[PDB]
Amino acid sequence: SPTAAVIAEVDELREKIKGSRNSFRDQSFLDQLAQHIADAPHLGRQPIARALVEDLRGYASEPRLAAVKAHINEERDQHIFSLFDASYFPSLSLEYLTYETLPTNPHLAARYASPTMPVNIIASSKGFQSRVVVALFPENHIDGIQRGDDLIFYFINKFVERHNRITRKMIDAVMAEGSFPLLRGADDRTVEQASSWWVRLHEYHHRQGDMPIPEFLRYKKLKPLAGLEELRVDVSGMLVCLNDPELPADEARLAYEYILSERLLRYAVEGIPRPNADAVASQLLFNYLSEHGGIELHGGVIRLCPELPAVLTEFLDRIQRIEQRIHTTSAEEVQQNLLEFTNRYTDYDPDAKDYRHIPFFAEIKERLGV
């Protein structure tokens, strides 16, 4: 295949430059890399590759990838190709992918607008095949720049895969029957649509409220606070799906079931031996809802209470009341108050200054191997 020849050429160069990450911004390296890219019989003739070669050859005087990002942001085609350095996506160096876009609801894209691209990866180099790489952000390029209107990509096929591997088995085992009826047996296109709604609502709400990111990002990287921010925007997404009447009723309920099931189940067991950021926040949600009448435990199984929408509003309101005090107190004091809220509903070890999976989800992890 012609695209398969291109990607085979990318993987071979990637293999040659692995172990050269310390010189990814050194011009002698970039000059050589650019030359090998230009001479690749198939890769080198791609328009996106013309752009990268140009950016790299000019990097000594202009350290950014403007021609590459212009191509990508303008969607000149559906190929992405660049040199990457994202510490949380370590598999990414020289990488290539082709994507396909997904259907989009007009009201959703208009009322909750953001430069979000929910896409499926069709083909890709080796670095993009890691299960860790679920998205691609503009600062992940070696230049490290992000602008408000740079496109952000979410690889929806990977979230479908995660839903079918973890969430479904968790729904069967942990939820009371009838908890997520639209999700039962739903095909991959159905899950795809719901996941695409989730990422659009997610990125939009990151920018809303009194401590939005990127502005307050450096105050929201502590494990419990990073998770809480992810939870804040997804609870907002859930409530949008429940409350905004201009969204199609069937797709809106489906997306609500998706976001809630992901936040309640899949995210709640992430991380070994300790919960990661998302899991701490999901365990905060679990215990908050239990204590405030939004869910109930019957026979080791979770029942969703009819009052759940009101308890979700209560929970988001609570987060927003803490964040609102940024106007009258320091960011550090809000941090302490968000931490104090989290620790009331999670298993925090004050000597380790870290968290343990609450027993409910520790048992589930043991039972299901998740």
Task: Compute the Cα dihedral for 67, 69, 70, 76 and give only its sign.
Answer: positive
Of the two residues 272 and 310, which places its CB atom closer to a second copy in the complex?
Answer: 272
Of the two residues 18 and 318, which places its CB atom closer to a second copy in the complex?
Answer: 18
Picking from 273, 271, 272, 295, the residue whose alpha carbon sits closest to that of residue 345 is: 295
Residue 156: which H helix or E strand, with range? helix 156-162
Q: What is the DSSP letter of 141?
A: B
User: Which residue in the set 134, 213, 222, 305 belongs to the binding site for a second copy (CB under 8 A)?
Assistant: 222
User: Which of these segments, 156-164, 267-275, 307-315, 329-337, binds a second copy (CB under 8 A)?
Assistant: 267-275
For residue 106, cis peptide bond before it (omega within 30 degrees of 0): no
User: Which of these segments, 198-206, 301-309, 315-323, 359-367, binds a second copy (CB under 8 A)?
Assistant: 359-367
Residues 121-140 interacting with a second copy (rule: CB under 8 A): 130, 132
Min CB(244)–a second copy separation in Å: 33
Q: Does residue number 331 form part of the binding site for a second copy (CB under 8 A)?
A: no
- Residue 100 bridge partners (DSSP): 120
Alpha carbon of residue 31 to chain centroid: 34
Min CB(233)–a second copy separation in Å: 19
- Whole-number Å distance between alpha carbons of 109 and 181: 26
Picking from 178, 154, 345, the residue whose alpha carbon sits closest to that of residue 261 is: 178
> Collapsing DSSP states into helix, strand and coil, what is residue 358?
coil
User: Which of these segments, 175-183, 189-197, 324-332, 347-355, binds a second copy (CB under 8 A)?
Assistant: 347-355
Q: Does residue number 178 form part of the binding site for a second copy (CB under 8 A)?
A: no
Q: Does residue number 347 form part of the binding site for a second copy (CB under 8 A)?
A: yes
Q: Does residue number 298 form part of the binding site for a second copy (CB under 8 A)?
A: no
The CA-atom distances, in angstroms, between 340 and each of 267, 320, 350 are: 21, 14, 12
Residues that bind a second copy (CB under 8 A): 18-19, 21, 87-88, 90-91, 130, 132, 218, 221-223, 226, 270-274, 276, 299-300, 347, 349, 351-354, 356-357, 359, 362-363, 366
